[PDB]
Amino acid sequence: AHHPVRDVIVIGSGPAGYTAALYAARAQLAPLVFEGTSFGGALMTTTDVENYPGFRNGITGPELMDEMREQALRFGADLRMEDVESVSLHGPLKSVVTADGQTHRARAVILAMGAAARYLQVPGEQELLGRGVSSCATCDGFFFRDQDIAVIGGGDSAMEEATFLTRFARSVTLVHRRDEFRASKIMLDRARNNDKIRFLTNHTVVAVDGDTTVTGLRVRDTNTGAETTLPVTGVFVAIGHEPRSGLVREAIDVDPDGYVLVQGRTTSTSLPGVFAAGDLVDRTYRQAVTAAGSGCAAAIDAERWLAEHAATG
Amino acid sequence: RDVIVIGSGPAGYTAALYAARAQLAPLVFEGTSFGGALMTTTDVENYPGFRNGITGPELMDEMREQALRFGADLRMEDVESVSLHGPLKSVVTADGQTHRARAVILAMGAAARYLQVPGEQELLGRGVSSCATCDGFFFRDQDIAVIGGGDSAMEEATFLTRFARSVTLVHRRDEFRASKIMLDRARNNDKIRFLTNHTVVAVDGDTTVTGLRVRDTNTGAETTLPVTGVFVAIGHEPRSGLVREAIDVDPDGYVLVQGRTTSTSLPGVFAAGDLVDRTYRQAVTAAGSGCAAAIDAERWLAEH
Numbered sequence: 307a308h309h310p311v312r313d314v315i316v317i318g319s320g321p322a323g324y325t326a327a328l329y330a331a332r333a334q335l336a337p338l339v340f341e342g343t344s345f346g347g348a349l350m351t352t353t354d355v356e357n358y359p360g361f362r363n364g365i366t367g368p369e370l371m372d373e374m375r376e377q378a379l380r381f382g383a384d385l386r387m388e389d390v391e392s393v394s395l396h397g398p399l400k401s402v403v404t405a406d407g408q409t410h411r412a413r414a415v416i417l418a419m420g421a422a423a424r425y426l427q428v429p430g431e432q433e434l435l436g437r438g439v440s441s442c443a444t445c446d447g448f449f450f451r452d453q454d455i456a457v458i459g460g461g462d463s464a465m466e467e468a469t470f471l472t473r474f475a476r477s478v479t480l481v482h483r484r485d486e487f488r489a490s491k492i493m494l495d496r497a498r499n500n501d502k503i504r505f506l507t508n509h510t511v512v513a514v515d516g517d518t519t520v521t522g523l524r525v526r527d528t529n530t531g532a533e534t535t536l537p538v539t540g541v542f543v544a545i546g547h548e549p550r551s552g553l554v555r556e557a558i559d560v561d562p563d564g565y566v567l568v569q570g571r572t573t574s575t576s577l578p579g580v581f582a583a584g585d586l587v588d589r590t591y592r593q594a595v596t597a598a599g600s601g602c603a604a605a606i607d608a609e610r611w612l613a614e615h616a617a618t619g
Numbered sequence: 620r621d622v623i624v625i626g627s628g629p630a631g632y633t634a635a636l637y638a639a640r641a642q643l644a645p646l647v648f649e650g651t652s653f654g655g656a657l658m659t660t661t662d663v664e665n666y667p668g669f670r671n672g673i674t675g676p677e678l679m680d681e682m683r684e685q686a687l688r689f690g691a692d693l694r695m696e697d698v699e700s701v702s703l704h705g706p707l708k709s710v711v712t713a714d715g716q717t718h719r720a721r722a723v724i725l726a727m728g729a730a731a732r733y734l735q736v737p738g739e740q741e742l743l744g745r746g747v748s749s750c751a752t753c754d755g756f757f758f759r760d761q762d763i764a765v766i767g768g769g770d771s772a773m774e775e776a777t778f779l780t781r782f783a784r785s786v787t788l789v790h791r792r793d794e795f796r797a798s799k800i801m802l803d804r805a806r807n808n809d810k811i812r813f814l815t816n817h818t819v820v821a822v823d824g825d826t827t828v829t830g831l832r833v834r835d836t837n838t839g840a841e842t843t844l845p846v847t848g849v850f851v852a853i854g855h856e857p858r859s860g861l862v863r864e865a866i867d868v869d870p871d872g873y874v875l876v877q878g879r880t881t882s883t884s885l886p887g888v889f890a891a892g893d894l895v896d897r898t899y900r901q902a903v904t905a906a907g908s909g910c911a912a913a914i915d916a917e918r919w920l921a922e923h
């Protein structure tokens with residue numbers, strides 16, 4: 307057999323990863339994709355995705371992901387459910403190392419490892435993920451029409467999130483661990499003006515009650531005191547996100563919070579032949595359509611760079 | 620109202636879908652002639668989510684009907700004028716009625732430039748494509764042509780050699796309007812054959828492109844390239860005419876947007892889809908930017 311040199315390796319599942327895989331495959335770049343031992347993206351918990359254009363009746367998160375995945379496979383993507391520990395990006399013939407110690411190399415690399423939402427890690431929380439507890443108001447906010455809900459955080463996100471929710475919720479109760487707020491004095495100012503916004507300062511969350519649905523939010527420390535229950539039917543966490551740039555952070559330019567910077571209005575990182583899609587880069591709109599778009603854009607950018615770069619030949 | 624959306628298509632519809640779900644009560648002017656670039660596409664295979672592919676119109680209808688479901692007001696009529704300066708923006712329909720909003724989302728996209736030769740429009744998406752990243756796959760091992768003498772025609776034709784066994788680049792003049800590296804790369808490709816000083820005049824075939832009727836040979840005339848697929852690469856024309864005095868556009872007419880966002884050069888005015896994008900003209904891309912416009916506009920509206 308002739309063991310050729312691969313054109314593209316993709317790091318990451320999720321809409322950005324799989325769309326890139328789909329495009330690269332269809333462009334006969336024979337993409338090798340490392341899905342992760344724990345594959346899928348943020349959508350593997352979302353019960354009903356209603357704002358992915360094309361699905362008038364909505365689609366289950368995982369259903370959507372399997373289709374993207376199966377699409378990718380159909381055009382010849384090599385998908386592998388394993389993790390990348392190391393990544394050498396400098397030079398032509400880039401390199402990637404999996405958890406088993408095996409090295410896998412390619413001419414271009416598509417970074418699409420996304421970004422984990424920061425969670426409270428309180429007993430009831432992960433259980434009710436996407437059946438009461440969301441981390442995204444632009445996604446799930448609709449599903450809480452006229453309900454009494456909470457928003458957890460004291461930052462610009464928590465403010466923006468909670469303010470936005472007021473168009474659906476009748477009560478948005480903004481809960482926060484400390485007295486001051488690490489958020490802006492305009493976002494706070496806007497939050498304070500909203501008649502549906504109620505503040506709960508110096509209170510940490512202790513649990514999230516309910517079996518099928520959020521039933522209450524167990525608060526605790528009242529600066530000095532302790533224990534209480536906000537009778538809410540939905541809890542939006544707004545602690546921020548943690549982009550998965552650890553493999554790449556300082557071979558490549560990243561912002562202070564760890565998001566990969568990309569050149570101009572493109573997907574090209576600060577290293578030739580290395581490209582970045584999805585929420586690993588995007589910190590403004592964390593949608594699947596936007597992830598899928600950028601994923602596609604990576605694959606096209608990479609094609610062009612490859613074409614430009616074998617073409618001297 | 621908070622937001623008026625100008626344009627149907629993936630960018631328009633996704634923006635509408637998002638705005639609607641955000642309870643911004645979006646008014647969308649679809650155009651008297653709906654749909655986008657996809658209303659001609661027979662089989663869409665690289666829109667992520669559709670393992671079995673979907674017909675262009677089918678996909679569009681779903682996007683449309685999705686938008687309707689979350690409370691979009693869709694109107695199949697044309698906007699003739701657009702006043703964007705100030706708060707309380709304005710739009711005027713072909714019937715002379717004014718419709719106003721706080722924000723506006725420009726999503727009028729960009730029409731591919733066609734030859735307008737009798738056979739061509741009839742076989743649109745059944746032989747004649749305007750997009751190699753889209754339809755290139757469908758031409759495996761076929762003899763095809765690419766029409767143009769610019770960098771697109773070069774890029775397009777060079778890309779297609781991955782699938783086609785012959786890509787025959789036909790062009791009206793001796794001299795090529797394209798770059799001398801794109802040309803250079805086009806010349807080095809074994810599968811690339813040039814046809815200079817030749818205009819196209821028809822496209823033969825009923826169910827499929829069967830030949831490409833070539834024309835004037837500088838002095839001579841008439842001939843037939845036995846091709847089974849014709850890719851047009853004459854460029855695109857972005858529909859910025861309503862907006863091209865108020866908002867910043869590039870020389871070719873594409874709306875410039877601020878940084879990595881959808882905001883044009885006028886506060887409260889936003890641009891998505893192929894009206895802005897001139898590098899990847901995909902539906903996923905347009906849908907993405909559509910959505911990004913809605914979110915940008917919501918945040919701008921909320922900021923106040």
Ligand SMILES: Cc1cc2nc3c(=O)[nH]c(=O)nc-3n(C[C@H](O)[C@H](O)[C@H](O)COP(=O)(O)OP(=O)(O)OCC3O[C@@H](n4cnc5c(N)ncnc54)[C@H](O)[C@@H]3O)c2cc1C
Nearest residue numbers: 318319320322342347348390419420584585592593594595
């Ligand atoms: C409840 C909910 C509802 C939502 N609703 C919508 C909606 O309606 N419409 C919409 O468009 N969006 C929606 N979203 C947002 C959407 O989930 C995200 O924007 C999307 O998941 C981003 O994908 P990504 O590819 O950028 O990264 P991710 O989704 O995180 O996927 C990237 C990944 O890469 C893998 N990975 C990372 N590093 C490695 C490594 N070193 N080795 C191997 N694998 C690795 C991980 O396993 C993960 O799968 C919703 C989200 C949630 C949580």
Ligand SMILES: Cc1cc2nc3c(=O)[nH]c(=O)nc-3n(C[C@H](O)[C@H](O)[C@H](O)COP(=O)(O)OP(=O)(O)OCC3O[C@@H](n4cnc5c(N)ncnc54)[C@H](O)[C@@H]3O)c2cc1C
Nearest residue numbers: 627628630650652653655656728729753892893900901902
């Ligand atoms: C043959 C073909 C195959 C394709 N295949 C794929 C594919 O497989 N996968 C993929 O991802 N992409 C594909 N594409 C590309 C995709 O179709 C485009 O990116 C998409 O159509 C762009 O949509 P848009 O929102 O930019 O607006 P466009 O689609 O460019 O146009 C939308 C429209 O908006 C309306 N409009 C314009 N001006 C006004 C106005 N002033 N007032 C009211 N309405 C107005 C018009 O009615 C028009 O229909 C294909 C394109 C073609 C032609």
Ligand SMILES: NC(=O)c1ccc[n+]([C@@H]2O[C@H](COP(=O)([O-])OP(=O)(O)OC[C@H]3O[C@@H](n4cnc5c(N)ncnc54)[C@H](OP(=O)(O)O)[C@@H]3O)[C@@H](O)[C@H]2O)c1
Nearest residue numbers: 426459460461462463464483484488544545546547589590
């Ligand atoms: N331009 C923008 O604003 C933009 C737009 C959209 C999204 N974003 C995203 O938003 C982030 C920006 O920061 P942010 O707005 O999220 O604020 P943040 O800086 O992340 O603030 C987090 C604060 O929330 C509180 N908190 C964290 N964990 C808690 C817990 N377990 N229990 C109780 N309280 C807890 C803490 O307050 P204390 O430490 O004070 O106790 C913590 O300091 C970025 O990561 C970005 O991804 C940014």
Ligand SMILES: NC(=O)c1ccc[n+]([C@@H]2O[C@H](COP(=O)([O-])OP(=O)(O)OC[C@H]3O[C@@H](n4cnc5c(N)ncnc54)[C@H](OP(=O)(O)O)[C@@H]3O)[C@@H](O)[C@H]2O)c1
Nearest residue numbers: 766767768769770771772774791796852853854855897898
């Ligand atoms: N940068 C890229 O490589 C690339 C990538 C993606 C998208 N695009 C987009 O595609 C366009 C790039 O420009 P382009 O290379 O397509 O050229 P263009 O800028 O769109 O110009 C069109 C030219 O095509 C020529 N032409 C070729 N054949 C013709 C014919 N049969 N009849 C009439 N005119 C004919 C004409 O000039 P002559 O006949 O004198 O040559 C005409 O001026 C831009 O709109 C850009 O947004 C480009």
Ligand SMILES: [Mg+2]
Nearest residue numbers: 463545546547
């Ligand atoms: Mg955040």
Ligand SMILES: [Mg+2]
Nearest residue numbers: 771853854855
């Ligand atoms: Mg073009």
